[PDB]
Amino acid sequence: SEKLTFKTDLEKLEREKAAQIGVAIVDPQGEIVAGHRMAQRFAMGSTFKFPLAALVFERIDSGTERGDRKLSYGPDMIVEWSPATERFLASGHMTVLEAAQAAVQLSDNGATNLLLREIGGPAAMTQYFRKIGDSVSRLDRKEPEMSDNTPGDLRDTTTPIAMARTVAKVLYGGALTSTSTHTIERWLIGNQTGDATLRAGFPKDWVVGEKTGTCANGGRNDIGFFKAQERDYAVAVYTTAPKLSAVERDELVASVGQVITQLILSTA
Numbered sequence: 381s382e383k384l385t386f387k388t389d390l391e392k393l394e395r396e397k398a399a400q401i402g403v404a405i406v407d408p409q410g411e412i413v414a415g416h417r418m419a420q421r422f423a424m425g426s427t428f429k430f431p432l433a434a435l436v437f438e439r440i441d442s443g444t445e446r447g448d449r450k451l452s453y454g455p456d457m458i459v460e461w462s463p464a465t466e467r468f469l470a471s472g473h474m475t476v477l478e479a480a481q482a483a484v485q486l487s488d489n490g491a492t493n494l495l496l497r498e499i500g501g502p503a504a505m506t507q508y509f510r511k512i513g514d515s516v517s518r519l520d521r522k523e524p525e526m527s528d529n530t531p532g533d534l535r536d537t538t539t540p541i542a543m544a545r546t547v548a549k550v551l552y553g554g555a556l557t558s559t560s561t562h563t564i565e566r567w568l569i570g571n572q573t574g575d576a577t578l579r580a581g582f583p584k585d586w587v588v589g590e591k592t593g594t595c596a597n598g599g600r601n602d603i604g605f606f607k608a609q610e611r612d613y614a615v616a617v618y619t620t621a622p623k624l625s626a627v628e629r630d631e632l633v634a635s636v637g638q639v640i641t642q643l644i645l646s647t648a
């Protein structure tokens with residue numbers, strides 16, 4: 381059984397790395413392909429920045445937001461890990477689209493908070509999840525405190541299955557216009573922060589786009605999509621490994637990518 385090998389290989393990684401590995405793989409319609417701890421809650425960390433950009437694109441599609449609108453800010457918006465926000469600070473603004481692309485591709489915290497200030501904060505992010513059929517994911521705080529990952533805390537969490545289904549809804553389920561869907565897909569493919577995580581474990585001819593996260597207390601996450609030939613999939617991986625180094629956590633997620641690959645290739 382290929383799915384049994386998938387489960388066994390994930391459980392070996394969990395034992396050997398003292399880790400918990402949550403995974404869900406779904407098809408474009410949200411049907412389950414495989415998973416592990418798929419409805420256990422994990423802290424989202426920066427992975428929510430992908431749904432945040434989808435919310436922004438919904439508003440652009442609708443006309444309630446404009447992509448080229450200039451969002452003014454001062455140094456009060458610079459927080460830990462704000463590389464683009466810091467570069468644009470002297471100019472005094474980033475556009476909605478610039479901020480969204482920095483949030484997705486650089487995980488820029490200041491840019492993320494700039495967008496949260498505009499769209500209604502964590503409560504509005506949570507309402508967007510509900511609107512697109514996700515009753516599970518919740519944003520309660522802005523960055524970086526939303527990544528605190530205090531053991532047992534349900535704030536700022538999702539589950540692998542709920543997030544994978546949200547990814548599928550955004551990329552394949554008609555949440556966005558064809559133009560906005562293509563734009564956000566390209567942003568995920570061009571992500572700058574994921575070279576050592578999931579896409580390091582997938583074949584080099586698969587089209588892969590994803591959004592990483594890192595949370596305190598050992599959280600390392602990666603969500604997105606892969607296309608194996610003509611077959612599209614949405615995927616969400618959330619891991620907790622408090623005893624590993626940062627590099628070993630990257631390698632853990634890459635290993636999960638290989639375990640996913642072995643399943644997908646064998647089930648053809």
Ligand SMILES: *C(=O)[C@H]([C@@H](C)O)[C@H]1CC(SCCNC=N)=C(C(=O)O)N1
Pocket residue numbers: 424425426427461486487489523524527572573574591592593594595
């Ligand atoms: C997201 O989880 C955090 C945010 C909550 O503080 C930021 C910090 C790291 S930065 C990754 C830099 N990549 C590099 N070479 C991420 C992340 O995407 O993992 N997001």
